[PDB]
Design a protein around this ligand. Structure first.
Ligand SMILES: CCCCCCCCO[C@@H]1O[C@H](CO)[C@@H](O)[C@H](O)[C@H]1O
Ligand SMILES: CCCCCCCCO[C@@H]1O[C@H](CO)[C@@H](O)[C@H](O)[C@H]1O
Ligand SMILES: CCCCCCCCO[C@@H]1O[C@H](CO)[C@@H](O)[C@H](O)[C@H]1O
Ligand SMILES: CCCCCCCCO[C@@H]1O[C@H](CO)[C@@H](O)[C@H](O)[C@H]1O
Ligand SMILES: [Ca+2]
Ligand SMILES: [Ca+2]
Ligand SMILES: [Ca+2]
Ligand SMILES: [Ca+2]
Ligand SMILES: [Cl-]
Ligand SMILES: [Cl-]
Ligand SMILES: [Cl-]
Ligand SMILES: [Cl-]
Ligand SMILES: [Cl-]
Lengths: 260, 260, 260, 260
């Protein structure tokens, strides 16, 4: 027997909001709810992570262009744990996308409809601008959290790094959050670890975009766009399409069932 | 079928104590239970974290005021994992607030009544004093775990850093621990990660208060109050109010339901 | 009561694929599903981890052959968190073995049949080749992610380090993923931590193979096989047999039941 | 509806073995099962952690006696994650105590009977000896994983550090693993984090004993007992008694119930 006072804890699924956006979803109320979750979540994630990167980039310079593992770990924690917290907070509000590339994968998977998806992506972009301006104002010194190529990487290598890192993130969302099972509630944790490793892959070489809202906001705030800024848009878009493609193949194959 | 010997493991919700404080709660017994949980939890959390900070601050000095990412990670682990353990231990005792700013958010949300909340906040303060005195006595050298501004931050920047970091913590409590669902049991983990990232944001600039009991106790023990000590009270109070405000908006909107 | 829209989240077990490979499993469809999961999972895990190791190995050299704890932690995170993500993504596809030594333990335990197991191990090997070639092409500089003895270890010490580290990994798989209980869904997390600690044990001394597909692929890509390369095959094979042996003893004893 | 093939995953509690040691438990079979779990678990935990400490202690020396945060984090990960893995593997075998101080707390709480408890503690001691000898033989150089006072700590400070760190560990076991609820399955994770923070507290000052089997085995292997070795026995024993005392007070108060 479950006592009545325990029942909500046992019966109420901790499921992404988009799983329950059916008929009735096109109200102004419901669009505002989704937008508010994406705004709050994206702001808190990116603001946190930008300040952490600002601090980490005050570490003494490493000679000869070498890497600084502790620095890279710190920045990776700021984005990976930051997104973890943001998605846990907003999971039942908006689904915690916090990333236009994530929303695009979800639109392709027909988890989120296109108009709602556009509203969410524009909200994420505005939140990233706001986060960049707030982190800039709140920290001494010049902005140190904008994306740039490093570590000898070319534009072409950077594009592929960005695309594969984004694919890992998006495939995690699809398999854990979109698919419906007893680990869906835990997806925010796995999404955070995916982003953590994508930052360990990419910071040194690309600064780790993985998220057009993350790359755009600091560029506006610093009034500085490298000519290669397009990699931070195309790379994540290609990663979203790659992840979708793999998910769609497995859905076509009815992966979860031995004997369909 | 569930075997009888397994039933408690399956049916007994691991829910914060305050969720079940209704009629009968105003007994001396029940107030003592709540106070004892907050005392034990806050002591063990802050004592642990103060000793860890003491050790981390014995690292060789970084030139030119630069940051030391490994040092910052270590201190962040001491507070973030420390609070994680403290809240898991005391979740069903007192609810594991361990922070007057957390209790204030819970009072505003009507999760905890005001008198009980005052008792809990005074207990947390006394525990923080005790923890500071014990960490001082048990470690060689001068106290190295008091809060101070650094990294070029002004008082005004420090106030806002403190407020936003505290907001992140408090919004995590509200959405995961107060809201009733299948992830409420896991809230202590997410609360610890929230505190971890708030320390990665704040240590370098403010020393990371985020908790008036954490800032006050070392100040008493070192017999030293900077004139800006008020930021460590007002900042977290403002963060608690911000987090409450966002939660209250979502409750007003019935966020969890598509068609109310 | 569980609402119908919540039911899948509550009822659908997040269980490894091999748990449900009975009659009907020998179709071409089902073999392709298993192979695709192992390919995708092993590629994403090893590619990620190889790039992270490449970066970590750009850290300034430590004098006198000493260790660099932050470097070792970074590499350990790349493999341990990398495998965590890979197994969570592929758990219901292929079971997320990602390691021929893991598949061998599962074959010995009769969790996976021999022919399917061979298909999975050959797929993992090809994925490791592909991952090594892609990480090589995508990063500047020479390959820095191949296995080699270091830290003064002899071949014989390295063989035993490899064997015991692999045993820890394989025993975790057996007790958490093969055994059927309320923590089976969480096995991917524990498997990742097991691999993390096995890397903290082995990187300094052997480079941390723990996985013949991980050791072979970089060796092909660098066109370089040390004469001691056999330790990276025999060590993990012996660890798989050790882990199996302990599991089998406990199964023979009916460990989970007081009164059989 | 739960499908029959999913039922074991949903119904079989992942509960410590000692929870089900009632009538029938005094067979030779059952004592051997408990001993084998403690042997395997304690060996794998301590062997892992000793090798990791050996490596971490090859880091370049820090001037002036200062601390090395990355080194301390690495050693803390080896013990905290090591114990996590060991307890998850052995939870349903022996309950995963892996520490005579833990077993003593459980005996005081009447979770484990005294004779069984003595068998388990002697097994842990022998496993720690075996682990120390194996880590010694498998690594080049002198043993670097024995406990010693450092960081300016006196014997008396070290005794109290050891006692409080052990209390944190033991109180976590009692509240999460002994108490029966929906988070009992997760206790191994929390136990690992508790041990992680206890190492961040103690390594610098005492070497972090926290476990008489951990302190004794290296001392035998190095043929070296400091005259203060008793702190590594009395400290953890006092911590076990402290944790018991707090748990017992809360049990006496019926902490989990508002209106008994
Ligand atoms: C004609 C015999 C084909 C047997 O093949 C079986 O086909 C089933 C029906 O398509 C699928 O459910 C099974 O997985 C497959 O093994
Ligand atoms: C008159 C038609 C308004 C339709 O709007 C619907 O209103 C419902 C009732 O308020 C809400 O439950 C739905 O979410 C909303 O879509
Ligand atoms: C004859 C008396 C032996 C009692 O021994 C009991 O034997 C049972 C039956 O084998 C097992 O289930 C019990 O665990 C064991 O304690
Ligand atoms: C006489 C009135 C005392 C009211 O006090 C109530 O006592 C109950 C019975 O002991 C306990 O269950 C309640 O927690 C307590 O509030
Ligand atoms: Ca600035
Ligand atoms: Ca002192
Ligand atoms: Ca290259
Ligand atoms: Ca040796
Ligand atoms: Cl509608
Ligand atoms: Cl359940
Ligand atoms: Cl009352
Ligand atoms: Cl078949
Ligand atoms: Cl008996």
């Amino acid at each position: 027997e479950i006592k009545p006072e325990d029942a909500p804890y046992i019966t109420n699924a901790y499921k992404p909001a988009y799983a329950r956006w059916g008929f009735g979803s096109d109200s102004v109320r419901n669009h505002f709810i989704a937008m508010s979750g994406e705004f709050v979540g994206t702001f808190l994630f990116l603001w946190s992570a930008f300040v952490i990167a600002q601090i980490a980039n005050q570490a003494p310079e490493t000679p000869d262009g070498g890497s600084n593992p502790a620095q890279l770990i710190m920045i990776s924690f700021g984005f990976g744990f930051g997104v973890m917290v943001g998605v846990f907070i907003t999971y039942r509000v908006s689904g915690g996308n916090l990333n236009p590339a994530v929303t695009l994968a979800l639109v392709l998977a027909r988890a989120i409809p296109p108009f709602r998806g556009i509203l969410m992506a524009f909200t994420q972009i505005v939140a990233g601008m706001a986060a960049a301006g707030a982190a800039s104002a709140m920290t001494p010194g010049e902005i140190a959290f904008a994306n740039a190529l490093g570590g000898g990487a070319s534009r072409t290598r950077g594009l592929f790094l960005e695309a594969f890192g984004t694919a890992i993130l998006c495939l995690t969302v699809l398999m854990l959050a979109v698919e419906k099972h007893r680990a869906t509630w835990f997806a925010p944790f796995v999404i955070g670890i995916a982003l953590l490793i994508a930052h360990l892959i990419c910071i040194y070489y690309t600064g780790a975009g993985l998220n057009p809202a993350r790359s755009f906001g600091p560029a506006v705030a610093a009034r500085s766009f490298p000519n290669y800024h397009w990699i931070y848009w195309l790379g994540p878009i290609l990663g979203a399409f790659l992840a979708y493609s793999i998910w769609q193949m497995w859905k076509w194959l009815n992966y979860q069932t031995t004997n369909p």
